[PDB]
Amino acid sequence: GMRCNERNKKKAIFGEDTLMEDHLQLREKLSEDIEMIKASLKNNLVCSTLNDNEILTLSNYMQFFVFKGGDLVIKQGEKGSYFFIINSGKFDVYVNKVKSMGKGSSFGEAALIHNTQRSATIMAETDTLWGVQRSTFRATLKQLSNRNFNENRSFIDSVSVFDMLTEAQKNMITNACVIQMFKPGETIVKQGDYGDVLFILKEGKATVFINDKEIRVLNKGSYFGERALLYDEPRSATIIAKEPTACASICRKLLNIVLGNLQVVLFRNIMTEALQQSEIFRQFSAEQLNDLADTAIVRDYPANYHILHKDKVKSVKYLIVLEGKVELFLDDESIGILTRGKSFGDQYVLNQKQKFRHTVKSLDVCKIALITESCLADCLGDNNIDASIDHNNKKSIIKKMYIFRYLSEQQCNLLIEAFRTTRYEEGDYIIQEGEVGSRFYIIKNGEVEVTKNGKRLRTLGKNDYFGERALLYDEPRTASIISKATSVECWFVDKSVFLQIIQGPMLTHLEERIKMQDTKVEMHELETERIIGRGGTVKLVHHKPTQIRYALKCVSKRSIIQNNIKLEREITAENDHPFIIRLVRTFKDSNCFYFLTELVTGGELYDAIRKLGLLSKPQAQFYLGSIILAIEYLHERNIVYRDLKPENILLDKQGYVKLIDFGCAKKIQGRAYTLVGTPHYMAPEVILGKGYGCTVDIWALGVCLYEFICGPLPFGNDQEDQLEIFRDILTGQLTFPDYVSDQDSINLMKRLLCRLPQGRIGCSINGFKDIKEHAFFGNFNWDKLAGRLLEPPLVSKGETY
Template sequence: MGSNCVCGQRQTILATSIPIQTHEVYLTKQTSSSQLNITSLPKRGNTFKVKHKAPVIDERRRRSDEVKEPSSASVSDKIKTEADKKMIRDALSNHFILKNLDEDSLRLVIEHMRFYTINPREIIFTQGEPGFIFYVLCTGRVELIINGARKAVINAGSGFGELALLDDRPRSGTIKTLERCTLWGVDRTTFKEAIKIVNALNLEENKNFLDSVPLLNQLTSEQKDGLLASLVTEKWSSGQSIVKEGDTGDHFYIIKEGCVSCSQKETEIRQMFKGDFFGEQALLYNSPRTATITAISEVKVVSIGRHALMDVLGSNLQQILYKNTQMIAMDKSPNLKNFSKEQKGKIINIMRIQNFSSGEVIIPRGANKGAFLWIILRGSVRGLKEKLNILTCIGDDFLVNPTEEKYEIDYIAETDVDIAEISKEEIENCVGGNIAEIHARNEALAVIKRVQLLKGLTEDKYKELIRMLKIVEFNDKDTVVEQGEPGSSFFIIKCGRVDVIRNGEKLRSITKHDYFGERSILFNDTRSATVKADGSVTCWMLEKNDFLEIIDEGIQQMLLSRIELQDDTIELSELVPIKLIGKGVLGSVFLTCHRTKNTLYALKTVTREKISYYGVYDSIVLERTIMMQLDHIMIMKLIKTFKDQHRIYFLEEYVKGQDLFDVLRHIGILSDADAKFYTASLVLIIEHLHERDIIYRDFKPENIMIDDIGYTKLIDFGTSRILKGRSYTTVGTPHYMAPEIIKGVGYGLSVDWWSLGVMLYEFLYGSLPFGEEENDPIAVFECILEYRLIFPSENDPMSPSRQLIQQLLNKNPGARTGGNLGKLKEHRWFSSFSWDSLLLRKIKSPYVPKIEIDTNLLEKAIRKNKTLEAAIQKVEGKDDFRSSGIIMKDTPAPPDWDSEF
């Protein structure tokens, strides 16, 4: 493939390419991965860079027949002695992936290892065959043979074949016994399941622990997930002091197992057991310990330090808790919930926190009911009819429905109370107008954001549109629009019902928050139907002339191009093949042209035979499900899918340009401004994915296209999935993989932020932060897990970009956004950066690929009238995939697996 690539060239389904063959590292006590010889790699500037066009690691990509290695060995479930367990532990400690296992996982893995006995001169596994088992040599000696030549002799106490625990890549060498040997072995499925069971149980238990802590009740689920990654497991022996009275405290503890004694001045006050917690004040105030906590038995706790908590949530936990409480209370209030998140945030930021002691008057009798809003943050208040507790709003009814009434009694603090207060005038200054009117506009805004023709506008443009809306009223039987007349306005029903009538026949009725006439504001269409009021009707109306005043020609063209990508009436028979533009293991991608509209599309074809051979039914369906959810100007658009008896087809947006890897090779090291352009683009892409619970898992320059105006397009969703909870699958390109993927302990959406941190480092310094000169996955993984993040000596330690890289490459997944996406976008490096201008494509791009489409080629293809089927068959005829040497077994198709295509 040339450097002038298109979306299809690297955009593949699960198995575009079988991962490249890499060498397993056969670690002995005398060698380490750092001693391996690394071949010369392609350079960018003065640095090395490997171009991996497809993910190198993906344990889902291939299925092999059940592996039976070593076939000549006898296998038993021998009971392990303490000496056996120690020998296995020592061997595992020489493998950096395995030595990172927590104690519970390690114990379970060792417990499931089976005992192998094999005679001299027998093959344990053969070079080129898929790997499945990791071994620890118990007695005897074996030799490593690569391409027929002995490379090493491995002695008892060493482990080998560890890459088999990641996926079933072909063995890079043959292992043969020199004498009678015994081994302990664990297969990949057992290994992963053991780790998954332990970590899933720990995760669920830790979640429940956090939920049980009143101090943390008002944290959001996102914030709690961040804290989960920060929890550290600690063990204490009977008699040990966990905390001491008078010491400065900065850790909070939850007991997982065992019992502790809590004492003051050497007098026991109480005992605490599983689920109890202590030290919570340390998270708020960093205050001295008020008691000594001593382990009575063997005790296991999970703890979190104040600094780790600040990394995840920010510097002031009390303030965060109160802001969360205010947001939850406003969301619960029927009178405040219609404020936008931004409006609520502005209100919360200026609310005053007041403290009242038990018995104090909070709201005096005779105060105006509509003058203030109060939110209870802590404690309880005695009101007119009942006790009011935390998360309760007072006065919200009268903000939206003004009244001259006054409070008839005093509202009094029943306990010590913290309460947030703001005046109606301050709220209206925050939201920019009358509260009732803002509520009505927000209703309309929610509808406008659903209008497909207007997708892609920024928040500022939406707000401008809302200000242009006019209220219009209709009586029963009034005609709102007439079929055949020119359209010049768009309507949203505020209240009431209208009938839609075409050629005198009623088609349907539509009601509150439905809309009609949207095409009239972008196209010169006549009305396709008559709309009449059924009873009294009130609508918001947007005039075309008003719309065109705020939407410039560039935005109009952008919206029109997006609309063209929503045309799902296209049929395969209307497409003319131009040329093959990409080919992978599973399928091929063709540049095609619509016969009448001359619009270019990329058409990806996947044969049913290959889907069966590689067993990727679920992956094909998942890719379609994910792509159909995505509608973002920086993400390649899936327009439609087709199927026939031979293939599955994906009709996609054709992206004319180059991938970012090739662009970086052309530009070299990026300036701060150029790096910010690409990084911010990726932030918007990740935001769109994560809002839909989609994890990408393979962010790297090769999967980012730079289109014909220099803007980014994300392609290739073969490694993506919709994430609920945690994933334990090893997927990605090693240099860009987060530590938690490598360790197999379970991971969430935050792995994508790690990959972004790797790319930002690459943009600014022209090299990779971990394993730059390594091309063996095991060596790369060791660098990621074991090495420090190092910056070039000339780099300013206080530069904002460096601080952002450190944040994104934090090994605590919860700390990578700095608390949430909003905080990430507000990072000092992005100060003064216009996110809206980027989304509207108003920022000059760093580089515009010089790509021309040969019009003669298009005309020739249309003139020849060649069929798609003929073009596809010609390519498929040269594809002898069953002779690839990889052992596969065809999988029967699940019933109706392709029903959505």
């Protein structure tokens, strides 16, 4: 017998949920059971706002548990996971005896939300329970809502009137779908009624009656009413349900709340897609394009018509085909045919004064959008269009750069206006490596090469830029830039001009940030100093080569109980906003993870408000406005923060804020369901378990504002119990103290603390713009905030921790 000798070839294999399977038993649900269940659930803080289909599904997941006398169910110490509705016998309760429960009552509702440590201890006096486990319960809620969402979404996709909505806009109105049930013989819509609702058959069938005469029958997927979302019209038919039926419905009143005017939205989308085929309008902003959409002259034309001929329509600069075909001519030569969505006019858009030489002639019946000299001027803010488009093209390039992006509008404009132009010949060194630069460049025409030590590094072309560091530092150029084309033209600005425009506090912020960011740093180059945080642990460290001081968070590797650290690091590294903590580098070893970030020395906002007391309006504008810019930045990158509270915001030494703890943040993909956050700040929709997005961060804004202005928290303020906090959030009353005298503040607080997201301000199509334009922010200059041109409420004297 040969034996295997590879010694390590054979490898060995190694709460309430445990005890409750002892009592589980199959049991058919009779009507008496089902109705008691529905009765119990309709009174549960989580299920009270559910329809009958939802509550029924939940019911069929309940399980039967039988007990004999003297048996235990829950215990005062153990962590809870089950929720029970009593079905027979009596059950005694014993915190630290207290009561007795029988047929109909329920207990352990807190476990339906989180792993709450039990309080009492329920035991069976007599000798059954309907029960359900948290995981099963929340998984069921997730699946119910998620499938409802996905189904309604695809039904939205099949309704032609929504075809030109963007992805984001489609998802927003999917959330507005209401489900209506129709018993057989019920009339869904009646002929001649000026209704405003679109119906989709999700399940069932219905019959169509025109003048009391059967005209056809409708099946799942059939839909009707799409014109009633755009116009005041009478129903063309009477529709009556044969079978019980399921209808996804969208109302126009809700559409207008979620989207505004559907026709206006669809046309912006269409026009924006057309305009962006042009290299010119591709430099315009979304708002600028929307404005051009809102003012374009739309005309229908017969075939063989001269829409534009030489000097005939003198004001038109650009032409977009919406439907049909037109042919372009220069004099007698056809130069092309434009179909649906294509356009013409780049030449005339750029040169306001140039006479239209071309001819446009319809080939068939068509519909045309015309952009005139006045639309352009109105879109841009003045009559000098040529100059204003050049100005705006330069604005577009620098508004993408951190350094220029957050300057006030007047500062930005002054810089654009200071730009000079110069030209180079091929092989000219625009910049020589090693020399001390004082200029910033933007390539207007041509191409250049980036080279260091003879070795090429990159090529740069039109609208590319280089050299910006010379605006902030006195230092040698690290690379040469060489004209790699005939007649390269550059726009440029001098450091001296920049320093006349940017002011001290912004300059200081940029100076310290770029340097710190780009500096290479190694662990052994780092000298620890004093400690400034225990929990992981955070030390004030000191870069030996540069003397630049940083902060270093040390996260014990033993704390890796999980996967989210890989995800937190991803998010934390990508963040590049003035009001969000800037990560420098991440280090790792045997025992500990490391985060190297900028050092923030002004303390927590949690302490600043307790030192200020109750914030005046200007002071609450400042901090809430700051938080709003940070949160808006994250949402644009589809990141939900999920743990907004004053504790998680630091003040830098100039008194501007920095958001810092990204432990609970997440890149959202559709709806999120995980229960995460700090209870006093959590949104109703997180607790209720039917899905949420980025807009939970907006609810927390409201909580914060309320603390700023009113003082205490708005819900669960003197509550310790996690469950009682959630209950006050879900159904408690929101009130304001009598010393709050600002109606606009109260309006804003009430609208940020709106429980259904669809009614929550800042949660519809305009996003944060509805918050920024609220009358609470009336006298507030959002422009000066990001640019550090405002006096902050509180500036630290020296460092604070």
